[PDB]
Design an enzyme around this catalytic site. Structure first.
Site, PDB file in Angstrom:
ATOM      1  N   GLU B 357      48.780-110.963  -1.532  1.00 15.31           N
ATOM      2  CA  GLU B 357      48.308-110.573  -0.206  1.00 15.31           C
ATOM      3  C   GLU B 357      48.877-109.222   0.210  1.00 15.31           C
ATOM      4  O   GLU B 357      48.182-108.417   0.843  1.00 15.31           O
ATOM      5  CB  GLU B 357      48.669-111.648   0.819  1.00 15.31           C
ATOM      6  N   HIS B 487      29.804-121.342  -5.887  1.00 17.42           N
ATOM      7  CA  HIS B 487      29.257-119.989  -5.848  1.00 17.42           C
ATOM      8  C   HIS B 487      27.754-119.977  -6.092  1.00 17.42           C
ATOM      9  O   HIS B 487      27.045-119.129  -5.539  1.00 17.42           O
ATOM     10  CB  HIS B 487      29.967-119.105  -6.874  1.00 17.42           C
TER      11      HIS B 487
END
Ligand SMILES: *[C@@H]1O[C@H](CO)[C@@H](O)[C@H](O)[C@H]1NC(C)=O
EC number: 3.4.17.23
Lengths: 99, 595
Positions: B357, B487
């Site tokens: 992150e 997906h």
């Protein structure tokens, strides 16, 4: 975000030093003459930036002032702060009483 | 009066509004995630609707501007990214039907249900159901039953929905002057307008095929190793000639194979490199973790964080006082405001996720110097690879020993390195052939090379021939098997993962070569080298203003996508597998059937 800080973005020509623009007419982008309304060739050149308290360097508001030093055929009105030392009653010293 | 001046005026008028609306939407989403109430969701939905309406209006206004007379490559790319019609190329009825299909698929798939027979209860959702069932299961019967219930009950009801979905996708692709939806997906990687650096769309497929063929030996050796371990652990459960079953891979989709790490490890008697106990027994928290991560990033050469990053981020779970999501999300705003939302614990996986992150936030601050239409990586894989390379370089034992996570008296045994390489292989290459097969199948079904009554047939034949996974029981053509993923049912690409996997290895090899460090790649250090950090930051600030080929050449030197770093990294593990598989069969045969 604040939107009260307007600014001019588009102009037809460069400005002269120490010049302030008063007219806020719309900018003409194309060859068609703008009749005072927006369009494909007519857009409002005045916009407003956004200042937020969470913005980093580059987006924060900075108050900048410009000091102009000019001299011409006129008496001086602004000078530097002249200092004053402590005088001696009776002693052979060099004195400077206002020139 | 020319078109260039009008285009520049439109861009300057649109960028500020786009940045403002993006900041407002990000703030609304942050207030919603950090405060679950009845008004925050409504405010976020209103902000999203206003942003969508404004973007559609600006796209319709910019569509009137030509693209051939403009010679600026940056302006041309911004207009191409802005003038996208999207779903507006079709009729309103078709568009609303597609939206309803997407919404119902998202509502059905994101919930799930077990509903075991002869039991009126215990029909939990997808997360507390099949996930926890297949997480730590060690029985063949229950895994086979769960796989059959997941592929049969949720395979035949989504066949007409998936058919209508792919039909609408093909219609939208043909309406936007594209031959197929796969062509529209591959057009994102194509770069033009630059002489000597353009990349054709047809070359990407050939490069992917070449990389897959070069990886084939490593995948075959890994499959042989897994088959040998399954035969040694589960006698009379897997044939040495046939392929491996689908429900014994430890994952419902076969993405992560870390569930079999504790079972297929040859040196399990040796201690692991987990530093969770070394940190939980002392005064350590998420604050010190982020401080050490910032120190590592500034030692590599990355810029520092702003003052708003260390005051608005909620790096601590507030508890039952208010609802807060703990999912790691890379919050990017592009206007100096950056934050990370993650309930980071004192474990090692959370440490790597926090490093990832922080790398994402560093990339965001790097490309924030560009307008909103360019605040993104060159491709859809660099944004994740920039953080993944840092998360991998931070997991080195030497760095943890220098910081203090690893004891200085800890010896460096080759068994731990072999186990780490095996874990990385099982977690990376265990899904690359499946990813390639799924991408090729979707491309062929969008182009129109597969018959309508042979979709699942070709899917299973490619899963048996190209991949080494075989089903225990055959299914009919009424069960839509490829629609079992997330997906594929939410309009997301799959080749992006493979591109990211290649790009992260390329970047790691480039950073190790620039650091003038000798030895293997798994122990190569990246910190304490400001030159490599500066060279990387010179590429991070490019964004979309320059093609990805030139961006890779400026840091790596290769003209196109390369795969040699992966081979150079897996060479020790490849030799170890060759030495261990000397008396075992390698490969799989499609003639055997476990039915
Ligand atoms: C980060 O902080 C260090 C410490 O003073 C400083 O030397 C460096 O220039 C800073 N870098 C940036 C990009 O602000």
């Amino acid at each position: 975000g604040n939107y009260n800080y307007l600014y001019r973005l588009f102009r037809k020509s460069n400005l002269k030093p120490f010049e302030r623009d008063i007219s806020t007419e719309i900018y003409q982008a194309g060859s068609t003459p703008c009749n005072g309304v927006e369009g494909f060739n007519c857009y409002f050149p005045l916009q407003s930036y956004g200042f937020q308290p969470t913005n980093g360097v580059g987006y924060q508001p900075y108050r900048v002032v410009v000091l102009s030093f000019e001299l011409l055929h006129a008496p001086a009105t602004v000078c530097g702060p002249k200092k004053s030392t402590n005088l001696v009653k009776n002693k052979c010293v060099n004195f400077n009483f206002n020139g | 009066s020319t078109i260039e001046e009008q285009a520049k005026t439109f861009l300057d008028k649109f960028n500020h509004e786009a940045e403002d609306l993006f900041y407002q939407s990000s703030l609304a989403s942050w207030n919603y995630n950090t405060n679950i109430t009845e008004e925050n969701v409504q405010n976020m939905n209103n902000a999203g609707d206003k942003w969508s309406a404004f973007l559609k209006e600006q796209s319709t206004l910019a569509q009137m501007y030509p693209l051939q007379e403009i010679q600026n490559l940056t302006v041309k790319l911004q207009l191409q990214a802005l003038q996208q019609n999207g779903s507006s190329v079709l009729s309103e009825d078709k568009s609303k039907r597609l939206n309803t299909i997407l919404n119902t698929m998202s509502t059905i798939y994101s919930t799930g249900k077990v509903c075991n027979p002869d039991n009126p209860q215990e029909c939990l959702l997808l997360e507390p159901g099949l996930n926890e069932i297949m997480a730590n299961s060690l029985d063949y019967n229950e895994r086979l039953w769960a796989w059959e219930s997941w592929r049969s009950e949720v395979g035949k009801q989504l066949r007409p929905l998936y058919e209508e979905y792919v039909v609408l996708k093909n219609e939208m692709a043909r309406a936007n002057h594209y031959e197929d939806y796969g062509d529209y997906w591959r057009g994102d990687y194509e770069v033009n307008g630059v002489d000597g650096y353009d990349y054709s769309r047809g070359q990407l497929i050939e490069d992917v095929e070449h990389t897959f063929e070069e990886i084939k030996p490593l995948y075959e050796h890994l499959h042989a190793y897994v088959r040998a371990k399954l035969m040694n652990a589960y006698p009379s459960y897997i044939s040495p000639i046939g392929c491996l079953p689908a429900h014994l891979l430890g994952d419902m989709w076969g993405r992560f194979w870390t569930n079999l790490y504790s079972l297929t490890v040859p040196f399990g008697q040796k201690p692991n490199i987990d530093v969770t106990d070394a940190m939980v027994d002392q005064a350590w928290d998420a604050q010190r973790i982020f401080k050490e991560a910032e120190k590592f990033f500034v030692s590599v050469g990355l810029p520092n964080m702003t003052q708003g990053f260390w005051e608005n981020s909620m790096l601590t779970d507030p508890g039952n006082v208010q609802k807060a999501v703990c999912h790691p999300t890379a919050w990017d705003l592009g206007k100096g405001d950056f934050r990370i939302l993650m309930c980071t614990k004192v474990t090692m996986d959370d440490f790597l996720t926090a490093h990832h992150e922080m790398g994402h936030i560093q990339y965001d601050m790097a490309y924030a110097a560009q307008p909103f239409l360019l605040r993104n990586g060159a491709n859809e894989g660099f944004h994740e690879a920039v953080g993944e390379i840092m998360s991998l370089s931070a997991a080195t034992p030497k760095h943890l020993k220098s910081i203090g996570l690893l004891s200085p008296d800890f010896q460096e045994d080759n068994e731990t390195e072999i186990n780490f390489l095996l874990k990385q292989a099982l977690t990376i290459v265990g899904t690359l052939p499946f990813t390639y097969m799924l991408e090729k199948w979707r491309w062929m079904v969008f182009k129109g090379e597969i018959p309508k009554d042979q979709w699942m047939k070709k899917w299973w034949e490619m899963k048996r021939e190209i991949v080494g996974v075989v089903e225990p029981v055959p299914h009919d053509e009424t069960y839509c098997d490829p629609a079992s993923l997330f997906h594929v049912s939410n309009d997301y690409s799959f080749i992006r993962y493979y591109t990211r996997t290649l790009y992260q290895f390329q970047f790691q090899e480039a950073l190790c070569q620039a650091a003038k460090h000798e030895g293997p790649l798994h122990k190569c250090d990246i910190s304490n080298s400001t030159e490599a950090g500066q060279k990387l930051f010179n590429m991070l600030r490019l964004g979309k203003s320059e093609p990805w080929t030139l961006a890779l050449e400026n840091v790596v030197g290769a003209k196109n996508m390369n795969v040699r770093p992966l081979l150079n990294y897996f060479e020790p593990l490849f030799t170890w597998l060759k030495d261990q598989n000397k008396n075992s069969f390698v490969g799989w045969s499609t003639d055997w059937s476990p039915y």
